[PDB]
């Protein structure tokens, strides 16, 4: 019969959880039923232990438990995630628009700055884009601009009393990996961003668990996105199963950049970036979009076949290069805006 | 400038801390400041880490400098501790309660400190369960030093502003480096003790603790896992005096103990408890004697080490032949009566 001390106590001892108890301490969580205390000691002993994949599956799969679902039938079979976890301008917010536009239905999950979890909420809104949808508006979203936006907070409701715990002691920690796999409308390719190198191979783990097609990507620079300044991890999941291999940006012709060039600021500044880049703007912040667009595109095409890795990356960076140079992302995101201002009506 | 994050982050990374942090993160907890998660993480994190003599050091001082303090002057010098840290999931207040009752009736001061547990974890509860009044303000333990010889801190009497961290270790159960602060933290700041701890690696950061008091102490560890010594196989000793450790290997086979099974002793709850104690302050033979026999014994060469004319060997010999008379004379015996009568006179 499981406890809070005999779940501590073993992973404490730098032990792996039994099955089951992962998930038992998840439902006591997301109840109310778990005390601020309780909720801390085992975010904390996770981190510390490091967490198996089994655990963290079994935290994502009570969480979806909780959260409200898209309906039925609304988000195509093909959707892919575009995000980083933790850790500089939203290259993930540019990228997922970037992707839309070359014809790849986008869902994203977020939150506000700093806040439970992964994020680009201030971003999008600094744009005129609504953040705050229910279910039934995501989904007409997905279907009439190619891009939808899951709120966290109002999707995962019942999170409420970890994202408190997590404020409080504003560490990260185990919940860092859970945005990336409690997505609401549970797309089944990503390009996954991981600031914490370790723990990338156990959310990489995750997804093959589900059979999804993803690249969890590692910027050996300390960035959870693909970059330009330095070479990559990048973890290859499909079929089951994963394959970690080294990526290099210049082995397509880019040029390294410097940190100080991706730099961001306010939301403002952001949303200048974001209208420089799709209006056609040349740099490393273009570079660093166009890379990360292609990763996903690459995810998306493995969920069809398995293509050999250099053409699909080939293809990925033209048809990113393309969605931007058209001027279909600019007017994707002008789509989305007015998509958005029509709700009222 | 310290912070919650950054001493949690230090933390969830392995690494020590900087000099100082742990006392900063004590004291928010002592002064109500720090919330129920910030307090539960911090002592999750420092247990997995692996806290040194240093940071448990600053822990315990900072402690103590919120405690109640005994009235000037009445804590005789060579006053001793006997006091386990607690098994997992097994303890040893029965042990510690006796051997402590045989060493004030040697004629050595004894003064202990404790709680409550509520089942089998107490203690407070066994004393209470002899007919002992464990909830006295600080002038009556005094009262207590110097009529009967012994005396007893309740710390949630002493160690009000404790109380935050109580709550939370209740909250998540699990044993955290804030299992450590009790024999570190006796109000009455004994300088002599025999302290037990159920973890190897942990005694040896206790023992440092107390080296840097000056204190003369026995950090005791049975190898078989016993936060006591042991009579089942032999116990790691790390002896503490003028500043220094002395880490060894102890086996009462030496002084002629026979070996016991980990199936003797005890203890269990409060009643369970108080009849072992009974039975063996009366004369009744048995594993359980011996190990208190053994433990009363280590209390008092802890004592001798503070006005220390004996070496170790000796200083043994004299303590079990000590401890051994206190019980066959019924000293033990009319001593615990005596602290009865005490507690019932006031
Ligand atoms: N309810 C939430 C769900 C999330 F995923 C993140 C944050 C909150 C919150 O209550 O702030
Ligand atoms: N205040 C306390 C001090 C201790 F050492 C142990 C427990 C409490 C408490 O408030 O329950």
Redesign the interface.
Known sequence: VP???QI??RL?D?RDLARGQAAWAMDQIMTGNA???????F???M???APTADEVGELAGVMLSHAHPLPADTVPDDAVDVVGTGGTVNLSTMAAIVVAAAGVPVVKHGNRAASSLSGGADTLEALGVRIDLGPDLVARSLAEVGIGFCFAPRFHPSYRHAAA?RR??????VFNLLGPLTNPARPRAGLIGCAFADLAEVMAGVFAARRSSVLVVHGDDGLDELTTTTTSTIWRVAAGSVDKLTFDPAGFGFARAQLDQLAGGDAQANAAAVRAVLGGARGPVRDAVVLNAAGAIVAHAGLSSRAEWLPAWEEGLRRASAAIDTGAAEQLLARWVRFGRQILA
């Open positions: 406890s809070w001390p501590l106590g404490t730098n005390r601020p205390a309780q909720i801390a000691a975010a904390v002993a981190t510390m232990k715990v409080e002691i504003g560490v990260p920690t």
